[PDB]
Motif scaffolding. Structure first.
Motif, short mmCIF file in Angstrom:
data_model
loop_
_atom_site.label_atom_id
_atom_site.label_comp_id
_atom_site.label_asym_id
_atom_site.label_seq_id
_atom_site.Cartn_x
_atom_site.Cartn_y
_atom_site.Cartn_z
N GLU A 59 -27.91 -2.13 15.50
CA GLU A 59 -29.13 -1.86 14.71
C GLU A 59 -28.81 -1.83 13.21
OE1 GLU A 59 -31.53 1.49 16.19
OE2 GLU A 59 -32.05 0.23 17.96
N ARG A 60 -27.55 -1.57 12.87
CA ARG A 60 -27.14 -1.57 11.47
C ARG A 60 -26.73 -2.95 10.96
NH1 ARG A 60 -26.31 -2.48 7.08
NH2 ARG A 60 -25.44 -1.29 5.32
N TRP A 61 -26.06 -3.74 11.81
CA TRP A 61 -25.28 -4.88 11.31
C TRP A 61 -25.72 -6.22 11.86
CZ3 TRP A 61 -23.22 -4.23 6.98
CH2 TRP A 61 -22.66 -2.99 6.62
N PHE A 63 -28.55 -8.06 11.52
CA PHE A 63 -29.07 -8.98 10.48
C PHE A 63 -27.96 -9.56 9.61
CE2 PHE A 63 -30.20 -9.79 6.08
CZ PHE A 63 -31.25 -10.72 6.20
N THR A 64 -27.07 -8.71 9.10
CA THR A 64 -25.97 -9.12 8.25
C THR A 64 -25.04 -10.13 8.95
OG1 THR A 64 -26.02 -7.03 6.97
CG2 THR A 64 -23.90 -8.31 6.91
N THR A 67 -26.99 -13.57 9.64
CA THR A 67 -27.18 -14.33 8.42
C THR A 67 -25.87 -14.98 8.05
OG1 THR A 67 -29.14 -13.08 7.63
CG2 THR A 67 -27.70 -14.09 5.89
N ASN A 116 -35.28 -5.22 12.99
CA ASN A 116 -36.69 -4.81 12.88
C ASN A 116 -37.55 -5.96 12.40
OD1 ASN A 116 -36.57 -4.84 9.98
ND2 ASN A 116 -36.16 -2.60 9.92
N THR A 118 -39.16 -6.62 9.59
CA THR A 118 -38.78 -7.08 8.24
C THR A 118 -37.51 -7.92 8.25
OG1 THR A 118 -39.91 -5.16 7.23
CG2 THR A 118 -38.35 -6.34 5.84
N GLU A 119 -36.50 -7.43 8.95
CA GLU A 119 -35.23 -8.18 9.08
C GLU A 119 -35.47 -9.55 9.74
OE1 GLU A 119 -33.17 -4.96 11.04
OE2 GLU A 119 -31.50 -5.23 9.66
N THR A 121 -38.28 -11.24 9.95
CA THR A 121 -39.08 -12.10 9.08
C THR A 121 -38.23 -12.71 7.96
OG1 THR A 121 -41.11 -10.91 9.57
CG2 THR A 121 -41.10 -12.29 7.62
N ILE A 122 -37.38 -11.88 7.33
CA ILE A 122 -36.46 -12.38 6.31
C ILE A 122 -35.54 -13.45 6.90
CG2 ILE A 122 -34.48 -11.85 4.82
CD1 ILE A 122 -35.88 -9.10 4.22
N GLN A 124 -35.96 -15.43 9.49
CA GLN A 124 -36.66 -16.68 9.82
C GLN A 124 -36.99 -17.42 8.53
OE1 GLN A 124 -39.68 -16.39 13.41
NE2 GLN A 124 -39.48 -14.36 12.47
N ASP A 125 -37.33 -16.69 7.46
CA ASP A 125 -37.72 -17.31 6.19
C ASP A 125 -36.51 -17.99 5.56
OD1 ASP A 125 -39.11 -16.33 2.98
OD2 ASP A 125 -39.73 -18.05 4.21
N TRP A 126 -35.38 -17.29 5.52
CA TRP A 126 -34.09 -17.85 5.05
C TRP A 126 -33.71 -19.10 5.86
CZ3 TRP A 126 -29.49 -18.48 7.68
CH2 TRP A 126 -28.31 -18.64 6.91
#
Ligand SMILES: Nc1ncnc2c1ncn2[C@@H]1O[C@H](COP(=O)(O)OP(=O)(O)O)[C@@H](O)[C@H]1O
Ligand SMILES: Nc1ncnc2c1ncn2[C@@H]1O[C@H](COP(=O)(O)OP(=O)(O)O)[C@@H](O)[C@H]1O
Ligand SMILES: Nc1ccn([C@@H]2O[C@H](CO)[C@@H](O)C2(F)F)c(=O)n1
Ligand SMILES: Nc1ccn([C@@H]2O[C@H](CO)[C@@H](O)C2(F)F)c(=O)n1
Lengths: 225, 242
Positions: A59-61, A63-64, A67, A116, A118-119, A121-122, A124-126
Motif C-alpha cells: 500500500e506504500r510502495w 505506485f512507486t 511507475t 488508491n 488517485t495513484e 489515475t496518475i 494510467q495518465d502517465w
C-alpha cells in the motif's frame, strides 16, 4: 523493421529461461530482459530494493514500484531498438510489455487496494502519455504466452529463490493468472490500445519440467508475422 | 523550433502567472504555457471514446493537497506527476502554437529544472523523499530529458524575485485552500534554492548549458502598478539580447 515479440506469463513461469534459449537460434534474434536488477538495486544511471519494498509494504510502495518498472522497461526496450540488430530478419523479444505492466500488474494492485484511486489515475495518465510518445516504436508484432499453473509458478518461485518473492501466496499468483488468461486466452481484457486486439498470440504450455518442440513452434510462428 | 523558449521562475505566489499573462498581450508572437496546477488539484486521465458519450469526466483526487497534508508519503508521487504533466503541456504547445509568428516567444511558467532542482530537491533535503525515491526521481528525470530536453531547452530565464514574506502574503491573497498551511520556513527554503540557482548561480545541475543560459532577475515585491513599466522595459531589452 525489427519484429517485436513480447513473452508474457506469470511470475516464474519460465520467460527468462525460454527467451535466453530462443536468443541462441539466430544471430538475428536479440532479447530485452525485464530490468529486475535495476529494481533490486536502485541506482541513477548499493541502492534500495524497490521490488522488496513493494512486496513488504504494497500500500506504500506499489505506485512507486510500478511507475519505475514501466519507465525502466520503456528505456530498455527503446535502447535495444536503437542499437541492436544490420540483421537479415531482425527479431527483438521483450520479456513482458508495457501492457502487462498496466493491465495485469498495476491493475491487480489497484483491484487489491494497494494503489488508491488517485495513484491509479496518475499511473494510467502517465502510461497513456508515455505510450502516445513511444507507443508506435514499441508496438508488438506478436505475443508468446508461456502458460503455467499458479502451483507451478509458486514452485518455480522457490526454485529460483529470489528472497523478496518467497512470501508470495498462491492466491496472489491465482489473481495474476486469471488476468493473463483474460488478456491472452479469453481475450476479454479491454485495453485502450486498439491494435492489440489484432496481434496474434502463440500460447505455449510450460507446466512440464524442461521444450525443444515449444522452441520450434516459435521459430515457425515468427515466419507467419 | 525557431520558437524562443523562456522560463519564468520564482517562489510560490511570487506573481508569475499574473505578470506573464499580462506581459504576453504585448505581442501576438508571445504565448504562455501555464503550470498544470489545475491538473494536480483535480486528478483525471483520458476517457475511452465510447465511455465519454454516456459517462461524465468526474472530479478526481487532489494530489497537490495530498502532498501538503503528508509530504513524506506523497512527495514522490506528486513531483513525478508534476513534471510529467508539465512536459506534456510544454511539448504540445511547442508543436502546436505560434505558427504564424515573426519572432515567436513561448514563455513557460516554471521548468523541468525547477521541478527537480528546487522543489523535488528541497523535498529530499527535508526527508520528505527517501534515498530510493530521490534516486528513482532523478533517474526518470534524466531519461525524460535525454528524450525531450532538446526540444525544451531554454533560451533564457526570467527570475521573479520576491521575499518569502511577500510570497506568504500573496498565498493568502490568492486563497488556494491547500496552500493555506504553508509556513514561512518552507517558503524560505525554496527562496534560498532559487537564489542559489538563479542569482548566485552556484547550484550545479546535470544540464551543462544552464550554467550559460542568460537570466533576467526582476524584483516583484512592489504592488503590481508600481514597477510594471520598468519590468516590461527590462524584459523587452532582455529578449533583444537573445
Ligand atoms: N520448464 C521448466 N522446467 C523446470 N524448471 C523451469 C522451467 N522453466 C523455468 N524453470 C526454473 O524456474 C525458475 C524461474 O524461471 P525464470 O525463467 O526465471 O522465470 P520468469 O522469467 O518467468 O520469472 C528458474 O529457477 C528456472 O530455472
Ligand atoms: N505585484 C503584485 N502586486 C499585488 N498582488 C500581486 C502581485 N503579483 C501577484 N499578485 C497577487 O498575488 C497572488 C499570487 O499571484 P500568482 O500570479 O498566482 O503567483 P504565481 O503564479 O507566481 O504562483 C494572486 O492573488 C495575485 O493577484
Ligand atoms: N509490472 C511488473 C512487472 C514485474 N513485476 C514483478 O517483478 C518481478 C520480476 O518479474 C516479479 O516478482 C514480478 F513479476 F512480480 C511486477 O510486480 N510488476
Ligand atoms: N515541482 C513543483 C511545482 C510546483 N509545486 C507547487 O504547485 C503549486 C503551484 O505552483 C504551488 O503550491 C507549488 F509551487 F508549491 C510543487 O510543489 N512542486
Amino acid at each position: 523493421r525489427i519484429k517485436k515479440i513480447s513473452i508474457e506469463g506469470n511470475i516464474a513461469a519460465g520467460k527468462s529461461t525460454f527467451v535466453n534459449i530462443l536468443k541462441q537460434l539466430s544471430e538475428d534474434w536479440e532479447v530485452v530482459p525485464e530490468p529486475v536488477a535495476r529494481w533490486s538495486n536502485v541506482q541513477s544511471t548499493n541502492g534500495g530494493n524497490v521490488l522488496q519494498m513493494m512486496y513488504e509494504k504494497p500500500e506504500r510502495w506499489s505506485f512507486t514500484f510500478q511507475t519505475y518498472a514501466c519507465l525502466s522497461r520503456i528505456r530498455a526496450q527503446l535502447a535495444s531498438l536503437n542499437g541492436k540488430l544490420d540483421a537479415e530478419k531482425p527479431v527483438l523479444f521483450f520479456e513482458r510489455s508495457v501492457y502487462s505492466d498496466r493491465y495485469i500488474f498495476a491493475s491487480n494492485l489497484y483491484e487489491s487496494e494497494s494503489m488508491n484511486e488517485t495513484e491509479w489515475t496518475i499511473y494510467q495518465d502517465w502510461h497513456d502519455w508515455m505510450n502516445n510518445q513511444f507507443g508506435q516504436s514499441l508496438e508488438l508484432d506478436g505475443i508468446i504466452y508461456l502458460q503455467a499453473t499458479p502451483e507451478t509458478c509458486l514452485h518455480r518461485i522457490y526454485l529460483r529463490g529470489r528472497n523478496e518473492e518467497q512470501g508470495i501466496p498462491l492466491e496472489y499468483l491465482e489473481k495474476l493468472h486469471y488476468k493473463h488468461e483474460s488478456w491472452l486466452l479469453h481475450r476479454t481484457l479491454k485495453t485502450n490500445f486498439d491494435y492489440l486486439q489484432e496481434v496474434p498470440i502463440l500460447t505455449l504450455d510450460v507446466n512440464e519440467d524442461f521444450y525443444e518442440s515449444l522452441v520450434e513452434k516459435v521459430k515457425e510462428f515468427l515466419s507467419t508475422l
